[PDB]
Write a protein that binds this DNA or RNA. Structure first.
Ligand SMILES: [Mg+2]
Ligand SMILES: [Zn+2]
Lengths: 158, 39, 135, 104, 100, 94, 1111, 263
DNA sequence: TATAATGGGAGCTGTCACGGATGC
DNA sequence: GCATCCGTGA
């Protein structure tokens, strides 16, 4: 058991799903420019589209792994429960996915790159917001967890 | 922990408090830890 | 969670005093008002009419009978003043009290249930038996 | 006897004086030269007990053959110095002052 | 002076450590063990003279008047007691380690 | 895990009672210098030194094994404390 | 060796000087090189100009000057002094009545000088002033959280420069102003400014319903005088409304430049936002006897305009980097200097009253003490003044580029939520999104970007290349975020033929938002990806292949790298590892062209073109703040011709001018016997054999002999009751000899201190009588080696009293320092990490024969577990390993820039070229494929790694291109059942080491009051058993263990003594007693006049003090 | 009021508070004895109340009294009793304890579930009194004092004392703890196995309970003294004796990572 | 020990929640 | 009956 850069296997289905999502995106933009749907509905439709796309490429990764390379290290570690989960593997092989603004709002454009392909400085910068927000969330969470724990201990101790 | 009837003298309250508390740092479409404290 | 919630429901509020010395709106433990009510109802006196009262863990922990636990939790000044005024006695029921005092906690090997257990070998047991049989 | 209950209650001025081994009349702590405690001060040995075990200030009675004996010279009882963690002093106020705990 | 709260890093030099107290206890016990190798009289002379009893060191006239002998006699038996102590010490080498 | 810990947990109505029993027995063995033991010379717990096998200095192991044998009687109010102490001191001087 | 660099991106500009944020700031603050008459009004000059003239006799300021440092930096470090320069001020005391003028230059004390590298030396210790990010002064408009359709206007000046005025529109309709928690109608203040209903009506009348809310008849009825008195009555209740007092207070609160200062940046921001011009930094003026408005009316107008919905008026983003600025060293120091100067001014004004009103000189009138006290306070006890991190040059370099939101006049950690911690869209090119601490400080402590630089106003700017038409110029423009939002900025990787954009569609940014744009729409373009990330972050190769959370740890841990004796630059670099060694001044270079005259270990002598002979001393084995040895070694030889900027000596943690934070090792990624389980690491003993990861560490010990009332402390070789074996390595003076090996318990410095007077116990009387030996007058206080420490003594420094050039603190006769060094080999428990955030402690060291090895017989070095890779999502280490294998067999290193890298195909190429050398050698040597290689190939083609039917060599090459090789288990000899990734990885030994962290205690020192054990390793303290540990023992139900923790093991005196005695006697431990800290609790409750009684079952009092506290 | 290492003096804030109180009190008594006007007496009494307040609880009412040249509020009795650093939480509900140690954890695969790798020196210091007793039993030292003075210097330590140490710790267990302790399994009992090196070796299966990994985490060792404490640890607190979560009832120590992967 | 002199100066600001008492 | 400040806690 080892890990090479090729052990993260980009499915052939990826490009297909991406192109489909692209033409769908174009259709939505066209539907917007003709004044059929508002900015809100357009944004929501784009987000939903990219979410479903993400699910599709994930399933593509795991199906390709199951059928073609059943002993693939990432696949084995994920399946056995030794390490990793479908989403992280998806980030390694399929797309990184949608990222959110500091305001919680999600960017219309997703990160099409994987960690095996490597990201672009703009994509990396976009992801950094989420990462930072996560770290801050954790740090701020531990304290409240401890305080609550102590409250419970004090009320239940006798 | 022993999968058998609890021994008399076991401190229940502390085990309860700890059992609820320990996963707390893991709590994250979800209300989460603030909801827990709210309750 | 049922344990904690159980500690949350611990208190009740008096709707009517009945024949007791309690006051309307006064808050006290359910156990105490039930003992009081069974003492009054066996005395042939009008029992206390009360109401279930739910308070959060912090208030419930600060409302405990032990003033050592309450003082070691939070609001030390408030707790200690009310306790000193009341001339409260801490019966050392809980764990925190005995921890502060540095005694043996009333749990595990410190539980009165398992604490007084004795151990003896059959030889000594029989010798003592014969000793007590000759008296 | 074994400890069972622990009681807390308000302390009367008479009780506070009953605890006290003497009144501290001076803000002084220790002497700026000898480093020994000042008399009627916060660190005074006449009030709170001896600095050294079974030995008075001036050193007239230096051993345990005298215990409970208060020296006539320095006025320091000869006992275990551990009592300096125990014995209370007091300060008599010219005017009554409210305990802030029962006010604020 | 400077404020202590600026105190948790400051050791207590006054109270004896467990090691020191244990050493003093073993010292007293070993001393009694060595004094048991004398007669009760010549041991009592040393105990009275060095202040192990009553805390005060008694003069030769006081120990002599207590036992009912001459001060020369009490000084002499004190000397022979100390001598037997020195011999027993040279032999067993027990009390050397307490000399620091 | 401690050898035969499950049977030991089976002996008592509460695990803490087991703990109390083992501890008290171990204190008995320590105070009386193991010569009050219910174990036969071949049942004695052994320890490997550079010299060879010696008696296990650990009184708790001894107490647990003794407990496993069934030659120990435990419970509450078996005998007044002073009487037990003095009788044990009579049978096994210190 | 050969260095092959990749990437197509050509940066038009080099990285700016990295320490400039410190150096240029302080330089601008002091103006020491500027002739006094030519000094601009800033910094120290601004402080003097702001404080003076002191009006009351009139004392005025002329000019100041800074002399030369009394001592060099090294000597300051040696003698525990401060590197500083004397500050003199020429003052002329003028009597306006007489006309009398007495002029003199007064000495105001010293000011700390900054070293070349941007740090300070305070009391012998190297320190760094961290820049502080805060909200920029100005006028902001933020949405009122309560009333949605309403807004809050906030006027913010500099910290401690005066109050925050809040303009708000109340529900009743009247406009309210808030100062010092007090709220009053703004109309009154407007009347004080001299405004009339006519002027307000015509000015603000455009916005319909608000002006009527501004209208109050009673206010306009009274003149500005009565309105002023009224306002003073509103602000200052109980204070008699004397007119002069009202004028003084109101002027002092608003118009006073002395008491009230908006930033120069605040001034600019106000002028820009409101669209006005300020005559000064104050909200108003006192002119011709009355008050004249500056700020308030434009802000009120803007507020009403924003509320009305008038186009062109926006709410402000306070997290925007246009609204947030940076206070550098110069500004903080200038602030504290201004405070001290103000206090000195108070002293002066007080001195102008007492004494003789006739004869006075500037010297008599000025007490410098408050100023000295202020500056010293700042450089010593401030939060922004931090102990310098010297661990490696990059440590300090990063430390100087730190940006903190904490400190005086800044956020509390608990005051900081998500918003402050977040990465703003304006952080691009300015504040690194990657490198921030992992913990509570996350987002509060940050790092300056590589190309980022702070302007004169305090805002961070980032460079952008101008694009005119479709052509990209070479001119760069540094922009503030506010200015950045104005244009459309293309990415740095956008395709280029010559200076023209080669793409039909480019990726750009508009207000931070990503957008696809045509080349005609491209106004500017990024300079380089490097500008997005900090220095440490830019040192991580294949950064685009690493998850941000792990890259954070990579950055952070690069700072923790220990300098190694054999330290070498990484085989895969980012190209920044040279410049970093340049800007951090550890490494030595040649000033001009010339020939090296002399080469020694101690020094290097160079003869330049000028003919002048310059001698450079080398720092050898100098102890840094963290104990890591800072030492320079010569990289040149006698007679070698060198140019300008050529390397002379290599600094600590640098190899031939390149940054070396660790070593390149041969790593195999594979699980090994659970020894690498959970991030643990297995290493080869070969590493210890060839001294890889071996580092020198120096510790400094210190002792003082002082004067006592019981007699002097003496440092001597005569120590009571000690043998010669103990005194062996001590010289005649009592100091340990240089070169001796000291272990725990050994004596570094002999010392004797007169015993405290005590009566010997009867036991001691009898003992003394028995052995016939008098008790010595002195006791052994000698400084000894602490447990777990030791080494070879490399230095001794002795400073006595009466000897020339030295004066100690009062009472101290002498001081002795002993410097002890040790050579630390890598060992189990030491922490290793790579640049990608993979960190682990070494859990096993195997012999060479147990190590997995290549078929040619070459064993690996480090064995990493692959389980660390997928969850952590850092793939950069993998690629680094592959290219490291290629570089291993090709005998070469590489430069892969950030985000413009070496990509997969090129690495495949290099790997092929490597395989030719790895295999073709074997085939030429007369060896065919191994049987085990055949089996491994069978399983590999079962895995789908190699195409079936090809020759063994073709399949082995197919594996090699995947970076995988055949590996034989050293124990069995049998191969691993599959091909394993093996290659060269750059791994560092982190500052966290077991030798430092291992601690154990039986019994030891106890605290004074609580009588509980002390804490920390240095004090030989015990481990803290807290509330949570008590909860653990309780939940377990172990009563006696817990009681042992609460009593016998801590704070129970009788209990612990009896326990130790029982254990050493072989007895079982005795029943515990009352904890002393409970007694302390009781007595502390008694001092609060609360009686605490311990009672029995009979409710009868129980005395735990045992009659000692009762009369 | 105590003299520190450097001959300098350090003192508690309670002293300065008491001095304030006494000075204002005495000045009050003198002002009364001299028959001062009602204004002065009023002011003095008010200052006396302010003083008593400052003594008992500082900052409670009005501006907190600070030492000259400092913004740091003095520490009153209330500030000593309450708070996270207060007497109760800091010194009562928890304490720093003797017979304890700390070090960096490393994974022993070879350990049985009930075992932990314990560095020689650590155990030598932790079990030190027992070691003194054993050394006095055997011929290593004349007595306890000699043995301790022998162990004081590291170069005076021979090879027999290690064997004696092995005799000492046999059958006994130690408690390993990792912060934060989030449940009762944050502390567990293990049979110590003396190992060369400065690192504590921890069994893999318990890593999930402590939430411990090998990236540089550290643990603390505690040595239960009495036969009672030792019985508690060996029975109730032993690692092999708790295999299931007290929370969910599910298995706590179970195959993970490498183990699962291999199987 | 004797000209006469007669109300003080810093605050300092991006936390969250419920328990009071006020008191709008 | 409901808005208005303050006090204590990590
Ligand atoms: Mg960890
Ligand atoms: Zn006396």
């Amino acid at each position: 058991i080892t890990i090479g850069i090729d052990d993260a296997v980009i499915p052939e289905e990826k490009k297909q799903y991406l192109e489909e999502a692209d033409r769908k995106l174009l259709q939505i933009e066209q539907a917007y420019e003709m004044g059929f749907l508002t900015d809100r509905e357009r944004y929501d439709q784009i987000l939903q589209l990219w979410t479903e796309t993400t699910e599709k490429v994930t399933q593509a990764v795991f199906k390709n792994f199951e059928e073609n390379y059943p002993f693939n290290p990432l696949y084995v570690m994920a399946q056995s429960g030794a390490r990793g989960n479908p989403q992280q593997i998806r980030q390694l092989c399929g797309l990184r996915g949608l990222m959110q603004k500091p305001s919680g709002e999600t960017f219309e454009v997703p990160v099409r790159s994987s960690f095996r392909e490597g990201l672009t400085v703009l994509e990396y910068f976009i992801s950094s917001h989420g990462a930072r927000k996560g770290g801050a969330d954790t740090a701020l969470r531990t304290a409240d967890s401890g305080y609550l724990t102590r409250k419970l201990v004090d009320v239940t101790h006798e | 922990s022993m999968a058998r009837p609890v021994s008399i003298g076991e401190a229940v309250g502390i085990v309860a408090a700890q059992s609820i508390g320990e996963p707390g740092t893991q709590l994250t479409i979800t209300q989460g830890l603030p909801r827990v404290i709210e309750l | 969670i049922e344990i904690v919630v159980r500690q949350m429901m611990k208190y009740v509020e008096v709707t009517d005093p009945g024949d007791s010395r309690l006051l309307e709106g006064q808050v006290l433990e359910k156990w105490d008002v039930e003992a009081l009510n069974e003492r009054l109802i066996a005395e042939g006196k009008t029992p206390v009419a009360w109401k279930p009262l739910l308070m959060g863990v912090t208030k419930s922990a600060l409302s405990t009978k032990s003033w050592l636990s309450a003082a070691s939790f939070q609001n030390t000044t408030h707790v200690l003043t009310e306790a000193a005024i009341a001339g409260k006695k801490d019966e050392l029921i809980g764990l925190k009290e005995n921890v502060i005092l540095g005694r043996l906690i009333p749990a595990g090997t410190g539980s009165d249930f398992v604490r007084f257990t004795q151990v003896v070998d059959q030889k000594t047991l029989k010798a003592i038996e014969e000793a007590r049989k000759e008296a | 006897k074994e400890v069972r209950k622990v009681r807390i209650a308000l302390a009367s001025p008479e009780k506070i004086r009953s605890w006290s081994y003497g009144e501290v009349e001076k803000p002084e702590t220790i002497n700026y030269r000898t480093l020994k405690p000042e008399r009627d001060g916060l660190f005074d040995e006449r009030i709170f007990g001896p600095i050294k075990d079974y030995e008075c200030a001036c050193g007239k009675y230096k051993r345990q053959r005298f215990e409970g004996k208060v020296c006539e010279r320095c006025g320091v009882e000869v006992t275990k110095s551990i009592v300096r963690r125990y014995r209370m002093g007091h300060i008599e106020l010219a005017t009554p002052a409210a305990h802030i705990w029962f006010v604020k | 002076p400077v404020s202590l709260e600026t105190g948790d890093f400051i050791p207590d030099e006054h109270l004896p450590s467990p090691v020191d107290a244990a050493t003093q206890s073993l010292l007293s016990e070993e001393l009694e063990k060595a004094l048991s190798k004398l007669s009760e009289r010549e041991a009592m002379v040393l105990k009275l003279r060095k202040g192990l009893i009553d805390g005060r060191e008694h003069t030769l006239e006081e120990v002599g008047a207590f036992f009912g002998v001459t001060r020369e006699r009490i000084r002499q038996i004190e000397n022979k007691a100390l001598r037997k102590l020195k011999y027993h010490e040279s032999r067993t080498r027990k009390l050397r380690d307490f000399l620091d | 895990a401690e050898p035969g810990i499950d049977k030991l947990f089976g002996m008592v109505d509460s695990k803490y009672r087991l703990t109390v029993v083992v501890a008290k027995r171990a204190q008995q063995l320590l105070r009386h210098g193991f010569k009050n033991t219910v174990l036969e010379p071949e049942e004695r717990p052994k320890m490997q030194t550079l010299e060879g096998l010696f008696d296990d200095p650990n009184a708790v192991t001894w107490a647990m094994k003794e407990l496993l044998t069934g030659r120990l009687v435990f419970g509450e109010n078996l005998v007044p404390e002073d009487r037990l102490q003095k009788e044990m001191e009579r049978l096994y001087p210190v | 060796m050969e260095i092959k660099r990749f990437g197509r991106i050509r940066e038009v500009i080099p990285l700016p000087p990295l320490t400039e944020i410190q150096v240029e700031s302080y330089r601008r603050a002091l103006q020491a090189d500027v002739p006094p008459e030519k000094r601009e009004n800033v910094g120290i000059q601004a402080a003097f100009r702001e404080t003076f003239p002191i009006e009351e006799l009139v004392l005025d300021f002329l000019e100041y000057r800074l002399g030369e440092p009394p001592f060099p930096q090294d000597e300051c470090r040696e003698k525990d002094l401060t590197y500083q320069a004397p500050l003199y001020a020429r003052l002329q005391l003028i009597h306006k009545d007489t006309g009398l003028i007495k002029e003199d230059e007064v000495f105001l004390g010293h000011i700390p000088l900054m070293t070349e590298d941007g740090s300070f030396i305070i009391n012998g210790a190297d320190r760094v002033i961290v820049s502080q990010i805060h909200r920029s002064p100005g006028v902001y408009f933020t949405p009122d959280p309560a009333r949605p359709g309403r807004y809050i206007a906030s006027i913010i000046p500099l910290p401690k420069r005066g109050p925050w005025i809040d303009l708000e529109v109340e529900p009743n309709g009247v406009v309210s102003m808030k100062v010092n928690k007090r709220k009053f109608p703004l109309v009154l203040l407007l009347r004080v400014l001299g405004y009339d209903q006519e002027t307000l009506a015509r000015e603000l009348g455009a916005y319909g319903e608000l002006v009527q809310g501004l209208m109050d008849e009673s206010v306009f009825a009274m003149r500005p005088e009565e309105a002023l008195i009224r306002l003073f009555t509103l602000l200052r209740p109980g204070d008699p409304p004397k007119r002069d007092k009202a004028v003084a207070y109101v002027y002092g609160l608003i118009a006073d430049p002395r008491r009230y200062d908006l930033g120069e940046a605040g001034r600019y921001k106000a002028e820009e936002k409101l669209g006005i011009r300020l005559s000064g930094r104050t909200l108003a003026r006192f002119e011709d006897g009355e008050f004249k408005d500056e700020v308030f009316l434009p802000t009120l107008r803007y507020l009403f305009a924003l509320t009305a919905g008038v186009p062109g008026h926006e709410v402000d983003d306070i997290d925007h980097l246009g609204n947030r600025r940076i206070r550098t060293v110069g500004e903080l120091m200038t602030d504290q200097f201004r405070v001290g100067l103000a206090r000195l001014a108070r002293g002066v004004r007080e001195r102008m009253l007492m004494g003789s009103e006739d004869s006075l000189t500037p010297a008599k009138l000025v007490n410098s003490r408050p100023l000295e006290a202020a500056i010293r306070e700042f450089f010593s006890r401030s939060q922004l003044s931090q102990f310098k991190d010297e661990t490696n040059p990059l440590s300090s370099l990063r430390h100087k580029r730190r940006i903190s939101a904490l400190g005086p006049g800044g956020l509390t950690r608990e005051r900081a939520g998500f918003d402050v911690r977040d990465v703003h869209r304006t952080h691009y090119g300015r504040i690194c999104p990657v490198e921030t601490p992992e913990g509570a400080n996350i987002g509060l402590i940050t790092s300056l970007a590589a190309y980022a630089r702070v302007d004169e106003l305090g805002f961070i700017r980032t460079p952008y290349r101008r694009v005119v038409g479709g052509v990209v110029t070479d001119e760069v423009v540094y922009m503030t975020a506010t200015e950045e939002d104005r244009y459309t900025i293309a990415q740095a990787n956008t395709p280029l033929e010559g200076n023209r954009i080669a793409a039909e569609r480019v990726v750009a940014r508009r207000k931070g938002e990503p957008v696809i744009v045509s080349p005609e729409e491209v106004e500017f373009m990024d300079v380089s990806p490097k500008q997005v990330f900090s220095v440490n972050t830019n040192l991580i190769p294949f950064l685009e292949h690493d998850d941000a959370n792990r890259a954070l740890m990579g950055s952070n841990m690069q700072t923790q790298a220990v300098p190694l004796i054999r330290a070498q630059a990484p085989v895969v670099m980012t190209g920044l590892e040279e410049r970093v060694v340049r800007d951090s001044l550890a490494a030595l270079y040649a000033e001009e062209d010339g020939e090296v005259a002399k080469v020694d270990g101690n020094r290097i002598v160079v003869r330049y073109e000028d003919g002048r002979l310059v001698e450079y001393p080398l720092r050898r084995f100098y102890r840094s703040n963290q104990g890591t040895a800072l030492d320079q070694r010569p990289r040149v030889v006698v007679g070698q011709r060198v140019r300008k900027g050529d390397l002379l000596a290599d600094g600590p943690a640098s190899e031939n001018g390149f940054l070396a934070l660790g070593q390149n090792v041969l790593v195999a990624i594979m699980p090994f016997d659970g020894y690498n389980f959970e991030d643990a690491i297995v290493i080869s003993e070969e590493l210890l054999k060839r001294d890889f990861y071996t580092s020198i560490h120096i510790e400094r010990y210190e002792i003082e002999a002082r004067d006592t009332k019981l007699g002097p402390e003496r440092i001597t070789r005569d120590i009571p009751h000690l043998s010669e074996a103990a005194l062996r390595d001590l010289d005649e003076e009592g100091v340990v000899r240089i070169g001796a090996e000291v272990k725990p318990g050994d004596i570094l410095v002999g010392r004797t201190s007169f015993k405290g007077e005590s009566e010997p116990t009867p036991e001691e009387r009898l003992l003394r009588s028995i052995f016939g030996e008098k008790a010595r007058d002195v006791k052994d206080t000698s400084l000894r080696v602490p447990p777990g420490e030791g080494g070879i003594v490399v230095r001794t420094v002795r400073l006595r009293r009466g000897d020339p050039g030295v004066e100690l603190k009062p009472g101290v006769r002498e001081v002795v320092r002993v410097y002890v060094a040790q050579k630390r080999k890598l060992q189990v428990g030491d922490k290793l990490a790579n640049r990608h955030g993979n960190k682990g402690v070494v859990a096993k060291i195997l012999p060479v024969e147990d190590m997995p090895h290549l078929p040619d017989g070459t064993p690996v070095d480090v064995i990493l577990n692959p389980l660390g890779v997928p969850s952590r999502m850092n793939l950069g280490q993998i690629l680094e390993t592959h290219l490291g294998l290629a570089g291993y067999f090709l005998g070469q290193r590489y430069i892969s820039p950030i985000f413009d890298g070496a990509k997969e195909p090129e690495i495949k190429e290099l790997l092929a070229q490597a395989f030719e050398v790895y295999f073709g050698k074997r085939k030429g040597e007369g060896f065919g494929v191994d049987k085990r290689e055949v089996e491994v190939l069978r399983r590999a083609e079962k895995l789908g790694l190699v195409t079936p039917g090809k020759t063994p060599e073709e399949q082995l090459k197919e594996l090699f291109l995947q970076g995988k090789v055949v590996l034989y288990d050293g124990r069995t000899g049998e191969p691993i059942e599959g091909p394993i990734v093996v290659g060269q990885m750059f791994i560092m030994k982190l500052y966290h080491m077991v030798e430092d962290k291992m601690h154990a205690r039986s019994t030891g020192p106890y605290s004074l009051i609580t009588q509980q054990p002390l804490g920390g390793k240095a004090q030989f303290g015990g481990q803290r058993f807290g509330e949570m540990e008590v909860w653990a023992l309780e939940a377990y139900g172990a009563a006696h263990t817990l009681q042992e923790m609460l009593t016998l093991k801590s704070d129970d005196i009788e209990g612990r003594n009896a326990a130790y005695e029982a254990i050493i006697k072989g007895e079982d431990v005795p029943e515990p007693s009352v904890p002393e800290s409970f007694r302390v609790l009781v007595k502390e409750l008694q001092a609060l006049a609360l009686d605490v009684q311990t009672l029995d079952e009979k409710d009868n009092p129980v005395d735990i003090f045992e009659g000692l506290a009762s009369k | 009021m105590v003299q520190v290492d450097g001959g300098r003096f350090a003192t508690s804030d309670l002293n300065d508070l008491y001095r304030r109180l006494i000075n204002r009190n005495n000045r009050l008594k003198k002002l009364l004895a001299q028959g001062a006007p009602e204004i002065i007496i009023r002011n003095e009494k008010r200052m006396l109340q302010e003083a008593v307040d400052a003594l008992l609880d500082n900052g409670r009412r009005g501006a907190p009294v600070t030492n000259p040249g400092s913004d740091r509020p003095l520490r009153s009795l209330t500030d000593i009793l309450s708070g996270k650093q207060g007497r109760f939480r800091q010194n009562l509900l928890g304490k720093r304890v003797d017979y304890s140690g700390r070090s960096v954890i490393v994974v022993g695969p070879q350990l049985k579930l009930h075992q932990c790798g314990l560095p020689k020196r650590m155990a030598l210091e932790l079990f030190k009194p027992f070691l003194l007793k054993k050394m006095e039993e055997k011929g290593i030292a004349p007595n306890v004092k000699a043995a301790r003075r022998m162990l004081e210097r590291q170069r005076d330590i021979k090879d027999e004392v290690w064997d004696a140490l092995e005799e000492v710790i046999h059958g006994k267990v130690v408690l390993l703890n990792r912060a934060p302790t989030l449940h009762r399994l944050g502390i567990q009992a293990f049979q110590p196995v003396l190992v060369e090196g400065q690192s504590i070796q921890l069994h893999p299966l318990v890593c999930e309970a402590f939430n411990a990994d090998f990236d540089g985490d550290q643990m603390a060792v505690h040595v239960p003294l009495s036969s009672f404490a030792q019985a508690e640890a060996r029975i109730q607190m032993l690692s092999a004796h708790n295999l299931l979560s007290p929370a969910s009832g599910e298995p706590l120590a179970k195959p993970s990572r490498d183990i699962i992967l291999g199987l």
